[PDB]
């Protein structure tokens, strides 16, 4: 894709995403990968430096992705001093929903027709080799499953038992249902 160039008056020419980063807007678009997650981390670290007190706006339009990659974002969001406000555009599914719910409480937003989906993790990696290796990877996946449900339950102010039921199979929610659930705080209109 051709990324448009915009001019900032101060003139400085930016690509439109660097221009929005100047306004403390970080985009997570598409699958969460090591590379796309590390750019989010680099941007979050950079923005904390520019101004530790101002909010960071983390716009999420993502079907999910790697758990470890999403956790690098998650821990960076929680570590850095400035509040990270999260907004769901289009969809926030799987780790995208996790990172959406991970925004600063009171500053988690969704657009009216966005779709939010939460579910237990799938393969975090293949389970081949010997039954001993398969046992190890099955145990690691269960620990991740419990960790994600526990952190989700914390984000949503719900019981761990509720997240265990609700993430058993793909649980699709409207912005209103996500607000009632506790994944987001507000729904934007204008």
């Amino acid at each position: 894709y051709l990324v448009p160039t915009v001019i900032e008056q101060s003139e400085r020419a930016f690509d439109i995403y660097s221009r929005l980063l100047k306004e403390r807007i970080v985009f997570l678009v598409g699958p969460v990968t090591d590379e796309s997650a590390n750019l989010v981390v680099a941007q979050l670290l950079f923005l904390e430096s520019e101004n530790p007190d101002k909010d960071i706006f983390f716009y999420i339009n993502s079907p999910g992705g790697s758990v470890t990659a999403g956790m690098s974002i998650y821990d960076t969001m929680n570590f850095i001093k400035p509040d990270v406000s999260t907004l769901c555009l289009g969809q926030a599914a799987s780790m995208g929903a996790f990172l959406l719910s991970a925004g600063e409480k009171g500053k988690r937003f969704a657009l009216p027709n966005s779709r939010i989906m939460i579910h237990q993790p799938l393969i975090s990696g293949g389970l081949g080799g010997q039954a001993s290796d398969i046992e190890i990877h099955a145990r690691e996946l269960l620990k991740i499953k419990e960790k994600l449900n526990r952190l989700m339950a914390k984000h949503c102010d719900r019981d761990l038992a509720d997240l265990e039921r609700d993430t058993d199979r793909d649980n699709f929610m409207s912005a209103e249902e996500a607000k009632e659930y506790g994944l987001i705080d507000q729904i934007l209109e204008n």
Partner: protein, 295 residues
């Protein structure tokens, strides 16, 4: 005699609220200056701090304590020798006091080269000629709101990436003042650096009610020029203290606010009859509310 630094701060305390570190730093630099004069370079002082922190008063209070004439000066009104004209007027042109007096130069941070060099002409001992004063033995107190000096220091001491960053003013070095835009030669004559913190909302209440020229007393006099008593609620003094603090003007903002909140009654006061007391509640400071009018 020459009062010791402990005696000098003992009376600086009667005029300046807070800024304990700046007061002892000043008490020592002034003692050394006037002890030197009773006898190898001299040492002037720079005051770094926010607007409304008391830099000017601290310089004035000192001159009173040391029994010397005091002249007010401003770096941004540059001609510099007319500060000596003023200093002489303060001592009836007896150069023996003017040549040992104190000059306070405000807004030093705003001239951060021609003006700085003119200031240096007087600070480095010269002879001013006004309608002859040897400035060698004049103590100069310079200061200003070096807000950008905080950034000069942050640049060198957490850091970007897993990092959080008068805490930094306390470690100002001549190099930081140079990076800020001041001329090294002017800095070299102002070796003592002292810092003043911003007053909080409790200190500003003492500004309102303790000094001989306190604002509450001024406006009580105004109402007292009629047969009317003026009284301020503690809450009123707290809300006005915050309002001035929220403009980042410190003590300065208190005057504008007292005038603001009372004007709506001062224009009625000449027509109101039978009035004995006007009480300023916190409601008067905060909203379009009338004071309690006691008839």
């Amino acid at each position: 005699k020459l009062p010791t630094p402990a005696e000098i701060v003992a009376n600086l305390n009667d005029h300046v609220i807070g800024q304990e570190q700046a007061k002892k730093a000043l008490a020592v630099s002034v003692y050394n200056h006037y002890k030197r004069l009773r006898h190898l370079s001299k040492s002037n002082i720079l005051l770094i701090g926010p607007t409304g922190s008391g830099k000017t008063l601290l310089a004035q209070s000192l001159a009173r304590k040391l029994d010397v004439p005091f002249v007010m000066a401003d770096a941004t009104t540059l001609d510099v020798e007319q500060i000596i004209t003023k200093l002489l007027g303060k001592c009836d042109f007896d150069v023996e006091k003017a040549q040992r007096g104190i000059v306070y130069i405000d807004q030093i941070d705003k001239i951060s080269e021609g003006v700085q060099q003119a200031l240096l002409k007087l600070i480095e001992g010269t002879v001013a000629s006004v309608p002859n004063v040897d400035t060698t033995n004049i103590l100069f107190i310079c200061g200003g709101a070096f807000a950008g000096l905080e950034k000069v220091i942050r640049q060198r001491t957490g850091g970007i990436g897993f990092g959080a960053s008068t805490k930094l003013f306390g470690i100002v070095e001549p190099e930081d003042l140079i990076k800020f835009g001041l001329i090294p030669e002017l800095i070299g004559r102002l070796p003592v650096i002292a810092t003043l913190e911003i007053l909080d909302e409790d200190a500003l209440i003492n500004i309102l009610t303790e000094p001989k020229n306190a604002l509450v007393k001024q406006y009580q006099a105004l109402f007292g020029m009629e047969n009317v008593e003026l009284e301020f609620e503690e809450g009123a003094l707290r809300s006005i203290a915050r309002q001035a603090m929220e403009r980042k003007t410190g003590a300065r903002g208190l005057r504008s606010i007292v005038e603001r909140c009372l004007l709506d009654t001062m224009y009625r006061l000449p027509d109101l009859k039978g009035l004995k007391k006007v009480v300023v509640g916190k409601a008067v400071i905060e909203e379009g509310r009338e004071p309690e009018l006691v008839f």
